[model samples]
Target: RFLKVKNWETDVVLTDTLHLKSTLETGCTEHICMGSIMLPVRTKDQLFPLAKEFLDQYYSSIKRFGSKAHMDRLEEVNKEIESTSTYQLKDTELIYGAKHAWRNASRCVGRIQWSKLQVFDARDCTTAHGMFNYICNHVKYATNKGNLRSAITIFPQRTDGKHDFRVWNSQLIRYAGYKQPDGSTLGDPANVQFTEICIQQGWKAPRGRFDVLPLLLQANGNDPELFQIPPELVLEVPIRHPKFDWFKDLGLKWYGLPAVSNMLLEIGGLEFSACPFSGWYMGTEIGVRDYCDNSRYNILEEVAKKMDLDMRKTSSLWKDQALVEINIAVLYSFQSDKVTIVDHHSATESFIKHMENEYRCRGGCPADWVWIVPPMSGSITPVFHQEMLNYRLTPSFEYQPDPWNTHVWKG
Candidate 1:
């Protein structure tokens, strides 16, 4: 395999931001909400100076403009408000904290770092614990769904796994929140749904003759109510219908007159028009070893088509299901050695740049350790939960029911 991160930005970062926001905002009032004060002051080293400089500049401009400085520059005021020590610090801390936490939260990036400007041996980003944790994070996100209506909630951290790689996790949060009618606090109240759908082709054989009949009948193949029937008959059924003499023809070959008439009567009464044991028919058909041998390649071909990938072109063996060794190995390079020495750190940067250029030419080959971006639609176990738990030390944040327990992340 390949590596995939689940709700990378939302579950990994934005969730923490909202949790921290709610913790601070829910405890204070507007005119003097502690959120403004506590959030801004929580990290003072970077907040105070920036706010003071901006405020000093604004007031100086007001003094210069005198009474002519009308209250018309609303945007200026809004800008000042945003740059205020309280707002800036809170935003800075939250954004910084989220990104910092994510970097240390395990190898969410997967194996292989394609940096043309640098040279570093890649390591496998996937791990048993990481996969388990990723799943748990999703369950938690799903459980919280609407309560935290933020686009950052479901956004992936990495896109394409190639160059121009930028990190804008939870970018959706900026657009996902709702504005209050009176323009007050942003509260998430929209419900979100995550559904799992499983679709499998063909029948189940171990249950004997007609084991899979029910399933096939339920699926309703290309010819509705006529899976195993000849395609031509399927096309004709609707036109002939109740007027057709099935008891005198097709019925006699498979079942007696009573069985055929009963089936027809049931269809006429709208009880069941198609075979109920269609799935069973398929199961029995596949049960024969000879049929299976003949159909296996065709089945594999169909699967390859739906997967939208070239198994034959990519696999070492195209037609033959068995493996064979290559006849020869060719060498294209003549023996020649070139050496250049540079500082260790600088050497890494130079190598990275060169490799990035070469790899970029290949359209970011080895994309995501051989996995496609947006990860093929499916489920994957996460690998960050344990790291988060390790950071938490103990399960105090009700957010993590049992932070220290590895099993908590498995599901």
Candidate 2:
């Protein structure tokens, strides 16, 4: 059977009996299976290329500081790769690598503060309980009394020929979606499958729209454990409009932090499956996509009717007007609650600045205009007009298969 490499900078197929020379020539560095009984077969050839790439980046970044000592240390690590197949990074190196990964993230608009990302090292954690504790700490620190900060808490890496540690939840903060008998979802539609999985794992699914889901964690070859998130740790904004008093009656709310939990953090060919990271939410993320999208809440028509927009004609621009009001309400509500949220206008401006900075520093910025543009006011944002090229970059986070469908859960 072929070993499925979960996250790699480049796609690679590893066979049961691998040919090392051919694999190295193909530029395949990292290839570890998730929840596989067989451990990865590490060799000098497998370690050399990854070590060299990491060393090259390290040297380039530190060369401006003129640190010969650091270079010597990295060189020593490089030499050691010849004798030993297993490698480990110092805390400082790991921290720097994590920051660099954030900097290299193409889809993120908040790269301006990439250097300031708080990375919590949880590599020593071996149990689900330990992972749960670190995640709680991550949520607490990132929440930051409503002023959310960009942070990443990395769990153990896939090494020593073992299956990777995994966090099942897509985010530490997510609402449970209960599929009612009438065929409508009572909560976040996006989380319906996940909520069901949580329920199957023995969680009491709540009936409310904004009920926070608990963390589902698993070590290699172990049954997943569910841990409830403390209500105090999660900061939720009760959405309301300054102009529309009726908006509060709708009873809409969202968490302050958008911490993504399922993406694999790949640093120097090493994969961290349980690295959850967060950045403050952009207004459109909640107002447009989460609430306004047809697949989601689909609240545009209700909001439009409340605003007294003519719903009969397409020319009335009812949907358009409702979208603006929704976005306005999101910004207003978050600001009223003193929660850190960015308006699309401000976010786009910052993204433009980020693009310029990236161009100056790295020659180009890879961004998806579709994702970068605000949902309500697309043409107005500078990012909408600008062309972007999306490409894979190492030391970056990537989407992986959901833990519910993975072999670990299957077992």
lDDT of 1: 0.20
Local accuracy of candidate 1 as per-residue lDDT tens digits, 281-367:
111111111111332212333323433444747554432221100000000000011111122223223333432342334222111
Q: Tell me model 2's lDDT, rounded to 2 decimals.
A: 0.76
Task: For candidate 2, write residues 1-411 as lDDT tens digits.
Answer: 222211132232222112111111212235942221211134667666676676577766767333777567667776766656556777877888888778766668777788898989998888999989998899899888988888989888766534678888887788888888899988888888889888888998767888899888987646789999889998999889988999988889988989888888776667777888888998999999999888888898889888899999989888988888888899999999899999888888888777667655665555545466676777777677665544455677777776666544444
Model 1 regions lying over 4 Å from their true place: 1-89, 110-411
Lowest summed-lDDT stretch of 10 residues in model 2?
17-26
